[PDB]
Design an enzyme around this catalytic site. Structure first.
Site, PDB file in Angstrom:
ATOM      1  N   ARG A  26     102.966  23.468  40.771  1.00  0.00           N
ATOM      2  CA  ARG A  26     102.855  23.280  38.597  1.00  0.00           C
ATOM      3  C   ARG A  26     103.840  22.511  38.429  1.00  0.00           C
ATOM      4  O   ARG A  26     103.368  22.000  37.402  1.00  0.00           O
ATOM      5  CB  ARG A  26     102.888  24.860  38.661  1.00  0.00           C
ATOM      6  CG  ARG A  26     103.964  24.944  37.587  1.00  0.00           C
ATOM      7  CD  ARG A  26     102.828  26.355  36.998  1.00  0.00           C
ATOM      8  NE  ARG A  26     103.960  27.420  37.718  1.00  0.00           N
ATOM      9  CZ  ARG A  26     105.002  27.890  37.675  1.00  0.00           C
ATOM     10  NH1 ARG A  26     105.594  27.219  36.725  1.00  0.00           N
ATOM     11  NH2 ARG A  26     105.050  29.155  38.062  1.00  0.00           N
ATOM     12  N   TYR A  30      89.583  16.601  14.742  1.00  0.00           N
ATOM     13  CA  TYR A  30      88.855  17.714  16.079  1.00  0.00           C
ATOM     14  C   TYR A  30      88.540  18.987  15.470  1.00  0.00           C
ATOM     15  O   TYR A  30      89.759  20.301  15.002  1.00  0.00           O
ATOM     16  CB  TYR A  30      89.012  17.885  17.313  1.00  0.00           C
ATOM     17  CG  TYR A  30      88.187  18.492  18.326  1.00  0.00           C
ATOM     18  CD1 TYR A  30      86.805  17.781  18.400  1.00  0.00           C
ATOM     19  CD2 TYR A  30      88.868  18.623  19.067  1.00  0.00           C
ATOM     20  CE1 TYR A  30      86.600  18.808  19.626  1.00  0.00           C
ATOM     21  CE2 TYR A  30      88.050  19.357  19.828  1.00  0.00           C
ATOM     22  CZ  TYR A  30      86.972  19.546  20.016  1.00  0.00           C
ATOM     23  OH  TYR A  30      86.239  20.417  21.108  1.00  0.00           O
ATOM     24  N   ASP A  82      96.660  11.753  18.819  1.00  0.00           N
ATOM     25  CA  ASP A  82      94.849  11.514  18.839  1.00  0.00           C
ATOM     26  C   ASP A  82      94.430  10.387  19.671  1.00  0.00           C
ATOM     27  O   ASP A  82      93.278   9.940  18.893  1.00  0.00           O
ATOM     28  CB  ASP A  82      94.516  12.643  18.372  1.00  0.00           C
ATOM     29  CG  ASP A  82      93.032  13.040  20.096  1.00  0.00           C
ATOM     30  OD1 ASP A  82      92.722  12.159  20.713  1.00  0.00           O
ATOM     31  OD2 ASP A  82      93.306  14.540  19.545  1.00  0.00           O
ATOM     32  N   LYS A 137      86.791  13.028  28.010  1.00  0.00           N
ATOM     33  CA  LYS A 137      85.461  11.758  27.154  1.00  0.00           C
ATOM     34  C   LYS A 137      85.930   9.990  28.450  1.00  0.00           C
ATOM     35  O   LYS A 137      85.648  10.377  29.008  1.00  0.00           O
ATOM     36  CB  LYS A 137      86.128  11.780  25.410  1.00  0.00           C
ATOM     37  CG  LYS A 137      86.369  13.135  24.935  1.00  0.00           C
ATOM     38  CD  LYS A 137      85.373  14.019  24.873  1.00  0.00           C
ATOM     39  CE  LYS A 137      86.136  15.451  24.527  1.00  0.00           C
ATOM     40  NZ  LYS A 137      86.143  15.340  23.340  1.00  0.00           N
TER      41      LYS A 137
END
Ligand code: NA
Ligand code: NA
Ligand code: NA
Ligand code: NA
Ligand code: NA
Ligand code: NA
Ligand code: NA
Ligand code: NA
Lengths: 380, 380, 380, 380
Positions: free
Chosen positions: A47, A99, A171, A196
Site C-alpha cells: 500500500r 467532467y 486534468d 483513457k
C-alpha cells in the site's frame, strides 16, 4: 531526445536485478526485512509502495517533466486524493463544464465535508480572478473540456494561482503528456485518467498524478497511504506497457482527426463542429501556444436524436460504448449517455443538443474512418 | 451446507457463458452497448462495475450473510469509503486501540473534513453509551484488536447503535468470515482488509465490505463510484482464489495457535501472553459467544528489545515482515515497527513494551512452529 | 522440517532483490546484458530460462527431493519432452491403463517417429521383466492409474529399470509430492500434470518434471529449449501460489475420501469400489509402503448409464466437468467421457462399465460430501 | 477495410456475453457441462481449447487471410508442431541460413526421430527443385532470413511445393502479417515467433500458426492437443493487446529503417549493409513483389570485434539484448551471440564477420536513432 524516444527510455521500466527489459509484476503485499527497519530496496508494504507501481509513477513523472508520480485505482481516485489536500471551509474553483464525475464528487461528496465549490467559465481567465474568495485554496481546470472542447489558458491560470496562493491543478487527460505539459507552464499538479489514452487499450482503470513540488508530493503520498486508493501491480504493468505506444497512437489519431474534421465541416447533415484545431474555435490560439497537438475527442451536431441513433447504427468502425482514448473509435450521444439527468431545456442551453454526437477517434485507418462516417452521415 | 462447503460453492464464481469453473478476469474498462442505454449484462464502465469484481463482491456478501458486497483497492480504502457515509460535524466512536492506519486516517485526514473522532475502551460497552454525543453517527469497532487482542461485545454494540441511531461497523479482519459474522449479530456494515487472511497469500492489497442494508449499500456504491478506490480485476481474481482455502488455512492456524500458546505459557523466558483463547483474557466468554474460532495473531512479552531481536534471528520458520494472515508465519516487534512514534513512556503505559513480540501464525507444520519458537526462546 | 513446513519454505519463492515475500512475475522475453555474454543473474532469453519459471522449478525439485525441475505448458508437454529423450527404434514400456492422453501421444504421434510402445500390466512387476526387449530404453508408470486406481510397485520398478539400463519415469499426478516421492525410491524422473492437485484451483494448465540426474536434466533442458513447450510466468506464479496449500488441501481430501468410501461400501445402490485404501484392493500393501496418504480419485459402479446420469443430476456439491484435483468435487462417467471411443464390449471387459462413476474429491465439508452423495444414491 | 482497420476490428476480441471490449482472460482449466457431452460454448478442457487462446488464434487467422489459427508456448513450439506433421523417413527442405533454433531442433531433435533435413540456398528456387527427393514432404522457408536478410521467392516456392506434393511452410516472423501474407501466395502454413513483432513489447514468448487447409488444421489441432505446447491465457491476452498497435509500430520502424540505412551507407566506418530495401540486394525485386514493407532487422559490418563492442557502448538508445521486434531498438553481434559455436573460418566464409552488427529497429524517434548510431560510429 525527442518525445517518441522519451516514451521508450524515460522513467525506470527495467529490472536492475535480472536485467529484464520490462518491469516485473510484484504481485506481493509485504517484504522481508533483514533487520528491523532495514529495507533491502526501500519496500516494506505494498500500500505504501510497490515496485511495479513505482515504475509507472516514474514514467508519468518523467513524461510530465515532474519529480514525483502517484498511481491511483482510477481517475476519480486521483482527483479525490488531490481534493483531499484541502480542509473544510476551503474553496475550489473549477471550469464550469468539468467532467461529470468530477462535478459529482465535489458537489455530492466533498461538499458534505465542507469543501466549497465554485464552477467558473475559465475560457476567460479574468473570470477566475473574480471568483477568488478569501477561502479559495485550489484552481482545478481541464483543457480541453468535455464534450464541447473548451480551451483554458494554462499559463495564465498558473500565474493567477501563484499570485493568489492557490494550488493549481490541470486534468490533462484529453491531451496526454505527449502534447501538453502543464507542469512546464507553472501548474503545481497535473493528473490524468490513465483509463483513457495513457493505458490506451480500454483494459485498465487508473489515475496518475505528477508534481515537481516536494511538499505537495509529501502530502499526496500521505493521503494515498492513508485513504488507500492505490493502483495494483498488474494494472500498473499494463499502464507502463500501453504508454510505450502513446506517441504512435496519438499521432495516428491526430491524422485521422484532421481528415475527419474536414469531412464533417463539408457534410450537409452536420451543423456545428467542436474541436480546438478549428481556427474559429474559442481560444484556438491559446491551445496552439500550450500544446503541440490535439485530442482525439470531437463533438458535432446532427439534426436530432433519431439522426444520432441512425448514424451510430449505420457506422461499421465506430463502437457505441462509454470512455474514450481506446484503440477503437468510440461513439456516444452525451444528451442520452452523460447528461441525461440535466433537464432538456438546460441541456439545449448548454449546447448539449439531442443531436450532439461525440466521437473518440481511434487508430483505425484514416481513410476508413472518414469514409465510414461519411457514408453513415449520407444515410441521414 | 457447512462452512467449508460454502467457501467453495457460495457466491457466483463461475462463468455462466462458457461454463468456466473459475471467474474470468475482465481486464477491460468499458462494454459494448447494443442500443443506447441497453447493457447486455448490466455492465457499462468498469469503475462502476466489473464482472470479476462483482464475483468477489458476491463472495464476501455470501460469506458474511449479507446482501451487498464492495471491493476496494485496500483495507484503508474500504474504511475511508465507510467513513465517508458521514458529514462534517458528525462524530464517530472507535475502540481506543484501533489499527494505526485507521486512527491515522481519522485523526489526520477526516478531522480536516470536520469528522469528530472519539476513541473509547469498548471492552466495556457502557463506555460506548457514555461517549455518545448528540452528533454521534457511527460506531466502529475491531474485535479482537491489535496487538493486545482486546475483545469487544459485538451483539451489545449492535444493540447500542440501534437504540441511539448509529451506523455500526465491525472491522472483522482478524477473525475472518469463517469464525465471526457481525452482520448476523445486528451490525450494519462489516469490513475486512482482504490483504490479510482472505487473500491469504501475501500477494493482494484489497478491502472488502458487506452489508444487508439496501440504503447503506446504495450510499456505499455511490461513494465507491465517485471516489474510485475500486479493486482491479486481477486482484479481485486472486482474492476469490485465495478465499477458497480460507477454511483449511484458518483451521491449521488455529491448531498451531493452541499448541504455541501452551508452549509460550510454559516457557520461562516469556511473561504475559495475549490471545482471546486464554481463559483469563478479558471478555474471553464474550469472544466464545460471538465466534467459533480464533485469530492467528498472538502477542507475548520477552524481557527487552535485545531479547526480541535475538528471538527473531534465532527462528527458522518465522519471517520478519509487515502485515499478517500469510501462509508464512510472520514475526514483528510493535514498539519498533508499528508504535515507534508513540513516546516510550506512553508505549509502556499501553502495554506496548520493548519486549512485546507479535506473531501471525501461518500454515506451517504445528510441531515445527512450536519447536522452532521454543528453541529460539531457549537461546534467551 | 515436516511436510507442511517444506511446502511453505522449500524452494526459492521470494525476491532476493526487494525482499518481496512472493515470486515476482517476470512478464518479459529478454534481458539486458551489461557486456556481451555477461548475464546479471544468469537470464538472457525467457524460453531458455525465466525467473518466475525458475521459482516453480525449484519448488517441484525440492518437493520431490530432486535436484532439477522443469515447467511445461501442460502435463502432456512434460510427457512429450520426456519421451523425446528416446530415439527412433527405441522401445518404451507403460502400464496398460495409462492416461488416455499419454496413450494417444505415444500411439498416434511418437510411433510415427519410430518409438515403439508396449503397454503392460505392471501390477505384477515381473510383467515388466518379460516385456523388456533389446531395444527397450524407458519404463513409464503411473500409480495409482485412472480410473480403476491400479497400484504399481515403484521401488521394484526402479530396480528393474536400473538392472536393465532403462530410464524410469513415474507420473506422480494422482498422489502429488505430498504423499509419494518416486525419486526417493530410485526412479530417474518424476512428472506431474500440475493442472490437477498441484495448482489445485482449476485455473492453470501445466506440467512439472523433476530429477536428481545431472545428465538427464541436461538432456531435458536441451529438449525444453529446442521444442519450446515452456510454462509462462503468470501460470508459473499461480502454480507456486497453489502449491502453498497442497498439504492442507490433500489432508482435507483424504479425510473426505475415507468417509465417502465407508458410505459407498455400505450403500445398496453401489457395487464395486476402486481405491487403494481399501484393504482388499490389489497391491494395497504396496501402496501403503510407498505412500503415506491417498489420492482423492475414487471410482465406483452404479447399475447403468441411467443411474449414473441420475446420480449426477441429484447431487448438489459434485460438479460435472473434466480434470481432477480441483477445490470443487468433480464427477464424471468414464464410459461416456474418456473411454467412449473404445467399443462397449471392450469397455465392459476392462471394467469400464456404463455405470462406472469417477469422483475427484474436493475440499468441501466432509459430512456435506458424504450426505450429498448418499442422498443422491438414495434416489436410484 | 485497410490494414490498420483490420488490426483493430479483425478477429473476435470482444466478449459476446458482457460486451467487454477486450477479450476476457480465462484463467481456467475446465468447464461445467450441463449434461454429459453438452458444452455451453464448445469448451471442455483448456489444453484442447481456451476462449482467450481462441481469440488470439482468430486474430492470426484473420491477419494472415487463413481459416484456422493455433497459439503455442513459443515460436519453436509452433515449429516443432508443424514438423510433427511428418513421419520418420520423411525429408524436409529448409533455407540454408534458417534460424539457429530451427536448425538445432531439426538436426539435434527431429533427426533422432528419423526426419531427414536438407538445407538449401533457396534464393534460387531451382535449388529447391534439385533438392527434392522421393521422400521430401515439406518445404520450410524464412524470408527474409537472419542475420543477412536473404530473400526467397514465396510464390515460386508455393508452386514448386504444389507440383511436387509438399507441405509448404513460411516462417513470417520478420515481416509480420502487416507486410507479407504467404497464404495469399499459395503457401499451406504460415507461422510466427509472436515473441518478436506481434507481441511487440518483449513481454510474451509465443508462437502462432495459421492455415486455410482444413485437413492440415485438423492434424495441427491433434498435435497441439497431444503434445501440449499451448499458449496460456495471460500470454494470449497480451498478444491480442500487442497486435493492436502492430501497424503503427511497423510503420514507425520502417521510417527509421529507411533513414538509418541512408546513414549507414554513407558512413566511412561501415562496410556492407544487408537489408532487402537496398536496390542491389539479391532478390530485392522479389521482395517488393511479395511484401509491401520491410523488416526492422538490419545487419552491417564494422571493422572488427573491438569496433563492434565500442559501437554498442557508445550508443544511448540501442540496447544490448537477445530477441528482436521490441519497442526498444536492440543491438547484437551475431559472431559472439548467435553463431559463436561455428568455427571462425566458417563464420567468415558465411559472411558472419567479427564486426557484423545486427540491429532490430524499435519505435524511438527516427532522428534520435539515426543521430545516436551515427555519433557512436563516429567514435570508431
Ligand atoms: Na528507461
Ligand atoms: Na512549479
Ligand atoms: Na458458487
Ligand atoms: Na441488520
Ligand atoms: Na523458501
Ligand atoms: Na537415483
Ligand atoms: Na473484431
Ligand atoms: Na492454399
Amino acid at each position: 531526445s525527442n518525445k517518441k524516444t522519451k516514451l521508450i527510455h524515460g522513467g525506470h521500466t527495467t529490472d536492475d536485478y535480472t536485467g529484464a527489459v520490462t518491469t516485473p509484476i510484484y504481485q506481493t503485499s509485504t517484504y522481508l526485512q533483514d533487520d528491523i527497519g532495514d529495507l533491502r530496496q526501500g519496500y516494506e508494504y505494498s500500500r505504501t509502495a510497490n515496485p511495479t507501481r513505482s515504475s509507472v509513477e516514474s514514467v508519468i513523472a518523467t513524461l510530465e517533466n515532474g519529480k514525483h508520480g502517484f498511481a491511483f485505482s482510477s481517475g476519480v481516485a486521483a482527483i479525490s486524493a488531490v481534493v483531499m489536500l484541502l480542509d473544510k471551509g476551503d474553496h475550489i474553483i473549477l471550469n464550469s463544464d468539468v467532467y461529470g464525475g468530477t462535478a459529482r464528487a465535489l458537489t455530492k461528496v466533498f461538499t458534505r465535508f465542507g469543501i466549497e465549490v465554485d464552477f467558473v467559465d475559465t475560457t476567460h481567465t479574468d473570470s477566475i480572478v473574480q471568483a477568488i474568495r478569501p477561502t479559495t485554496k485550489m484552481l482545478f481546470i481541464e483543457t480541453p473540456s468535455n464534450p464541447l472542447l473548451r480551451v483554458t489558458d494554462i499559463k495564465k491560470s498558473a500565474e493567477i494561482a501563484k499570485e493568489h496562493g492557490l494550488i493549481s491543478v490541470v486534468d490533462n487527460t484529453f491531451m496526454t503528456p505527449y502534447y501538453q505539459n502543464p507542469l512546464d507552464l507553472g501548474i503545481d499538479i497535473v493528473l490524468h485518467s490513465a483509463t483513457k489514452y495513457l493505458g490506451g487499450h480500454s483494459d485498465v482503470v487508473a489515475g496518475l498524478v505528477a508534481t515537481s513540488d516536494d511538499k505537495l508530493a509529501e502530502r499526496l503520498a500521505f493521503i494515498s497511504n492513508s485513504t488507500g486508493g492505490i493502483l495494483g501491480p498488474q494494472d500498473s504493468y499494463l499502464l507502463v506497457r500501453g504508454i510505450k505506444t502513446l506517441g504512435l497512437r496519438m499521432e495516428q489519431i491526430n491524422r485521422s482527426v484532421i481528415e475527419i474534421i474536414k469531412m464533417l465541416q463539408a457534410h450537409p447533415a452536420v451543423q456545428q463542429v467542436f474541436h480546438p484545431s478549428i481556427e474559429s474555435h474559442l481560444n484556438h490560439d491559446v491551445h496552439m501556444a500550450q500544446a503541440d497537438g490535439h485530442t482525439g475527442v470531437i463533438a458535432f451536431e446532427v439534426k436530432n436524436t433519431e439522426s444520432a441513433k441512425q448514424l451510430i447504427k449505420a457506422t461499421s468502425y465506430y463502437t457505441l460504448a462509454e470512455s474514450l482514448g481506446a484503440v477503437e473509435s468510440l461513439i456516444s450521444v452525451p444528451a442520452l449517455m452523460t447528461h441525461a439527468s440535466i433537464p432538456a431545456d438546460i441541456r439545449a442551453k448548454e449546447g448539449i443538443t439531442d443531436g450532439l454526437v461525440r466521437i473518440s477517434v481511434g487508430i483505425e485507418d484514416t481513410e476508413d474512418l472518414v469514409d465510414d462516417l461519411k457514408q453513415a452521415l449520407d444515410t441521414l
